[PDB]
Amino acid sequence: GSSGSSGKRITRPGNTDDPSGGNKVLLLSIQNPLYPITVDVLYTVCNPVGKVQRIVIFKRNGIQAMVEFESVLCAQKAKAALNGADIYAGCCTLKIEYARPTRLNVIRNDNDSWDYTKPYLGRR
């Protein structure tokens, strides 16, 4: 013979979430990028506001690119100065939007994505 009781209580790893907005990283979306938009084009109008950490240009349903800043503060100002900052003749408008993630990723250094923070990669 044998006998035993089995009991348990609901348990989840997830923790209370929050819509807390504000991050050093900002999702920049170029509007009507008829002309090729490289990290330079951005960092060019971005630097004028503050130091830039890195810029990753991806192609997902529209020429997009994420730009990170030293700290959040800088992001606040930069966001504005860039918010609606026309780059080309009535076109290539900048559409900044506090990205979801706070940290970015850069496989390698190229026109697509550039990493200023660490300019030392290939000591060829």
UniProtKB/Swiss-Prot annotation:
RRM domain sequence ranges: 23-101
The protein's assembly and partners: Interacts with HNRNPL.
Function field: RNA-binding protein that functions as a regulator of alternative splicing for multiple target mRNAs, including PTPRC/CD45 and STAT5A. Required for alternative splicing of PTPRC.
Record-given protein name: Heterogeneous nuclear ribonucleoprotein L-like
Induction record: Up-regulated in stimulated T-cells.
